[PDB]
């Protein structure tokens, strides 16, 4: 029935988990370290917070053209 006590003790679990868990950890590490998190989720880099034109907190101030405007005042 595998009541979660025998599987954790068995080596069959840890043979296939000595690769999957470290590979996922390394995948997350590279996902952060390659800038892919910034590119995918749109968070600005520490050097990409203030553009030369605006030096204050950005404001969306529009609804139906919000996509075009956020493309305008984002970090290019």
């Amino acid at each position: 029935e595998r009541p979660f006590s025998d599987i954790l003790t068995s080596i069959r679990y840890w043979v296939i988990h000595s690769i999957t868990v470290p590979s996922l950890f390394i995948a997350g590490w590279l996902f952060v370290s390659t800038g892919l998190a910034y590119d995918v989720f749109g968070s600005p880099r520490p050097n990409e917070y203030f553009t030369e034109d605006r030096q204050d907190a950005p404001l969306i101030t529009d609804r139906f053209n919000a996509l075009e405007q956020v493309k305008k005042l984002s970090a290019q």
Binding site: R45, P46, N47, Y49, F50, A57
Partner: peptide, 9 residues
């Protein structure tokens, strides 16, 4: 704080 040291709210 950002790379230039400005306070991010």
């Amino acid at each position: 704080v950002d790379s230039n040291g400005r306070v991010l709210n």
